[PDB]
């Protein structure tokens, strides 16, 4: 029953290291998510200006 | 024994909370992207329309110059 | 007390498994959302290329027209 | 313990995939941002052209 407690402890340690690695991956993913959402919001504003602009070109041409 | 069980539990919960925020980021991302996609559809349309206008405008002036 | 501490242990251990099982679900949902998003971003990228190409022509013809005038 | 570990190892596999997907997404959005930047510019110079 010694080698068993030994295994359980080994698995528990692996499960913990896995969880910590997952925490690291999730952290970098959140940073990218944040950067991406901020870019999309910016891009949304630029596309609104692009659309207003095209309306002006199309209008003044007529 | 107890301290370790507590730490592993705590780490897993902290991960689930972090993963819930990431899930939300992707959901919000798909929403924004689909919305901007509709604005892109329209812009694409306005651009082709302008291209034809401008192309005729230049053709007119080119013909004029010719004669 | 000791009996209760074991109750806690079995409590946390079970909660961990369920949290893990929930995470597997949230992650799967996130992935599908991410794929739909990728699909959309791919189409938009091409639309944006034509848009850019159209604008090049517009500024080209406009300069020519202005020149001709 | 053996099942929890098994469920955790599998979750790690999906989180790795999700992470990688988040990183590639950010790069895509940024590249498209470059185009839009140019588009917005070319459009400003088309507006002052029509005037």
From Swiss-Prot, chain A:
Principal location: cytoplasm
Post-translational modifications: Palmitoylated.
GO biological process: associative learning; axonogenesis; calcium ion-regulated exocytosis of neurotransmitter; endosomal transport; exocytosis; locomotory behavior; long-term memory; long-term synaptic potentiation
GO cellular component: actin cytoskeleton; axon; axonal growth cone; BLOC-1 complex; cell cortex; cytoplasm; cytoskeleton; endosome
Keywords: Cell membrane, Coiled coil, Cytoplasm, Lipoprotein, Membrane, Palmitate, Phosphoprotein, Repeat, Synapse, Synaptosome
Ranges of residues in domain t-SNARE coiled-coil homology: 9-62
Region entry Interaction with CENPF, spans: 1-62
Location relative to the cell: Cytoplasm, Perinuclear region; Cell membrane; Synapse, Synaptosome; Photoreceptor inner segment
Cell membrane listed as a keyword: yes
Superkingdom per UniProt: Eukaryota
A Gene Ontology molecular function term of the record: protein domain specific binding
Family recorded in the similarity comment: Belongs to the SNAP-25 family.
Subunit note: Part of the SNARE core complex containing SNAP25, VAMP2 and STX1A;this complex constitutes the basic catalytic machinery of the complex neurotransmitter release apparatus. Recruited to the SNARE complex following binding of the SNARE complex component STX1A to STXBP1. This complex binds CPLX1. Found in a complex containing SYT1, SV2B and syntaxin-1. Found in a ternary complex with STX1A and VAMP8. Interacts with HSC70 and with SYT9, forming a complex with DNAJC5. The interaction with SYT9 is inhibited in presence of calcium. Isoform 1 and isoform 2 interact with BLOC1S6. Interacts with CENPF.
Function: t-SNARE involved in the molecular regulation of neurotransmitter release. May play an important role in the synaptic function of specific neuronal systems. Associates with proteins involved in vesicle docking and membrane fusion. Regulates plasma membrane recycling through its interaction with CENPF. Modulates the gating characteristics of the delayed rectifier voltage-dependent potassium channel KCNB1 in pancreatic beta cells.
Protein name: Synaptosomal-associated protein 25
Source organism per UniProt: Rattus norvegicus
Record gene name: Snap25
Whole-protein coverage range: 11 to 72 of 206
UniProtKB/Swiss-Prot annotation, chain D:
Mod. after translation: Phosphorylated by CK2.
Protein name: Syntaxin-1A
Assembly mode: Part of the SNARE core complex containing SNAP25, VAMP2 and STX1A; this complex constitutes the basic catalytic machinery of the complex neurotransmitter release apparatus. The SNARE complex interacts with CPLX1. Interacts with STXBP1. The interaction with STXBP1 promotes assembly of the SNARE complex. Interacts (via C-terminus) with KCNB1 (via C-terminus); the interaction increases in a calcium-dependent manner and induces a pore-independent enhancement of exocytosis in neuroendocrine cells, chromaffin cells, pancreatic beta cells and from the soma of dorsal root ganglia (DRG) neurons.
Its job: Plays an essential role in hormone and neurotransmitter calcium-dependent exocytosis and endocytosis. Part of the SNARE (Soluble NSF Attachment Receptor) complex composed of SNAP25, STX1A and VAMP2 which mediates the fusion of synaptic vesicles with the presynaptic plasma membrane. STX1A and SNAP25 are localized on the plasma membrane while VAMP2 resides in synaptic vesicles. The pairing of the three SNAREs from the N-terminal SNARE motifs to the C-terminal anchors leads to the formation of the SNARE complex, which brings membranes into close proximity and results in final fusion.
Entry superkingdom: Eukaryota
Cell compartments where the protein resides: Cytoplasmic vesicle, Secretory vesicle, Synaptic vesicle membrane; Cell membrane; Synapse, Synaptosome
Domain t-SNARE coiled-coil homology: 1-51
Residues of the full protein shown: 195 to 245 of 288
Homology family: Belongs to the syntaxin family.
Tissue expression notes: Expressed predominantly in cerebral cortex, hippocampus, cerebellum, adrenal medulla and retina with weak expression detected in non-neuronal tissues.
């Amino acid at each position: 029953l010694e080698e068993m407690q030994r295994r359980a402890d080994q698995l528990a340690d692996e499960s913990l290291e896995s969880t910590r690695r997952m925490l690291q991956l999730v952290e970098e993913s959140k940073d990218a998510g944040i950067r991406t959402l901020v870019m999309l919001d910016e891009q949304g504003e630029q596309l609104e200006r692009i659309e207003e602009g095209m309306d002006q070109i199309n209008k003044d041409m007529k | 024994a107890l301290s370790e069980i507590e730490t592993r539990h705590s780490e897993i919960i902290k991960l689930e909370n972090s993963i819930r925020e990431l899930h939300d980021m992707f959901m919000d991302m798909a929403m924004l992207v689909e919305s901007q996609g509709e604005m892109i559809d329209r812009i694409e349309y306005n651009v082709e329309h302008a291209v034809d206008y401008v192309e005729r405008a230049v053709s007119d002036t080119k013909k004029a110059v010719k004669y």
